[PDB]
Symmetry: D2
Subunit: 138 residues, 4 copies
């Protein structure tokens, strides 16, 4: 399959109506998953499901500017399950990313990095086996 | 030691940690003067210029960060510290008087220590008028703390 | 009166069966409150109700060793209301602190700083007017 | 060549007298390089040269425990150049990791993670073209 950590090129950027689809299986005893949309020295959009933060599951979203993480956005909705298949979809709008897991709307993160066109890679890491990493331009 | 009376809210003594009120906030050509003595065995000193829930300008002499002396400047937007600015020139010395001056300019804060210029810090918080207070903490005995326009 | 931020001295430390009681009033439009149990250059126990993190109220607890915050322990129970009087009680046990607000038990925080006898100072700050800070030894 | 980010498996963990060698070339217009010795959910040893942090080059070393970085150790000795090859070496000792660049000793980093045998993985990342990554005992 695809090896983790995995890089999905997005040369010529993210653009509105774009749909990133990530399919795979969560490992057993999973601790974490991360999607990292990168722009140059920054991480425009960090989607980080955490399977155990003091015995809560939480999704944390944020932006890294060079070495500094910004304001954390925390969500408790968490459809992943150890040892189970998943589908993560990221829809790009003008003002925000929208994220769905297992065909159901989960969250939105407003853009902090504005130059969408410069977002050139998606890092996919953590305790997953990856089956596919692809995107749709509608 | 708290001074009550008819001239305003109860006032804290000149003992660390201390808030120096800045009514009107800050404006260019403002000059803050701070006099005191560094305690023996100082670990740290800090100046914290505050606006609402942010620290617009944090000036933080550290006397041992892994056996180096370093001044760290930064900004805190409510719970988040941003890009650190580190400098190595460190005039302070344990058990020694000092004078810190902060001149406000439109582009930046200039900081001078013992009559000689030390560093510049560009404004990340732009609404200078909103900067309400100045925190002064750490391992210093404090002697005076005041502002005047120039 | 008591001026905020206030230092309550605990010379000779914190000791099992000790119960700290802080009375006061939350200011209008409060943003934050903080209790900081200090030890030399460390904060052995920071208890930090925040009135707005991304439109949630959360109590954040942690320990600061010199310049580093450790693992956050987050709790969403939050009895404080803007403009209303409060009571914070902190009971010291051999293995943890217990915290209760307005007579309702809130949480436990396990000691990370083990030398309880060196915890000299309790800092009380944020958007409050303070009426009394005292403790009982039982 | 090999593709960044990359995990060098360290089967049977690290153990004194292990010598890890990494060859590559710094990219033009570098910003960062990172070595991440991993144990479960932690980074035992992060070695992070930075080509421009407020117009200063610096190497930051640290340990990550779940989501928390501890105390930073900053060194200003920096032997890397944009476009230039390099040979990074890491010698494991009982008390610390010793690091050499282009066969000249650079720094030490005391162990914070003590169970060396659980350090299962070394992560290589940043603005480089990784040629090889291998180890051997000495
Ligand atoms: O300590 C290794 C770690 O540092 C993080 O950046 C730090 C930075 O060095 C410090 O100056 C700043 O104030 O705090 C940052 C957040 O911990 C990097 O983000 C991380 O990638 C590591 O390199
Ligand atoms: O953990 C106590 C500590 O939190 C700091 O803010 C954190 C914040 O909770 C976290 O979500 C963010 O990503 O990291 C921040 C920097 O550590 C507060 O700034 C500090 O005052 C304490 O309250
Ligand atoms: O940036 C000023 C701010 O620094 C915090 O400490 C930093 C420290 O300088 C850095 O090396 C480490 O990697 O991250 C720490 C936590 O953000 C202090 O805790 C805080 O008091 C301020 O001084
Ligand atoms: O926010 C994304 C960023 O979080 C870092 O972890 C935070 C942690 O969530 C917070 O509770 C604590 O106070 O500060 C940590 C350091 O910023 C992760 O380490 C990083 O990997 C990202 O996931």
């Amino acid at each position: 399959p695809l090896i983790v950590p995995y890089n999905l090129p997005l040369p010529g950027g993210v653009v509105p109506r774009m749909l990133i689809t990530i399919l795979g299986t969560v490992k057993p005893n999973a601790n974490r998953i991360a999607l990292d949309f990168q722009r140059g020295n920054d991480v425009a959009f960090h989607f980080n499901p955490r399977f155990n933060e003091n015995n809560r599951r939480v999704i944390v979203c944020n932006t890294k500017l060079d070495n500094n993480w910004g304001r954390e956005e925390r969500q408790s909705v968490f459809p992943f399950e150890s040892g189970k298949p998943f589908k993560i979809q990221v829809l790009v709008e003008p003002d925000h990313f929208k994220v769905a897991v297992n065909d159901a709307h989960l969250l939105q993160y407003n853009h902090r990095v504005k130059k969408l066109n410069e977002i050139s890679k998606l890092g996919i890491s953590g305790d997953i086996d990856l089956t596919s990493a692809s995107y749709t331009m509608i």
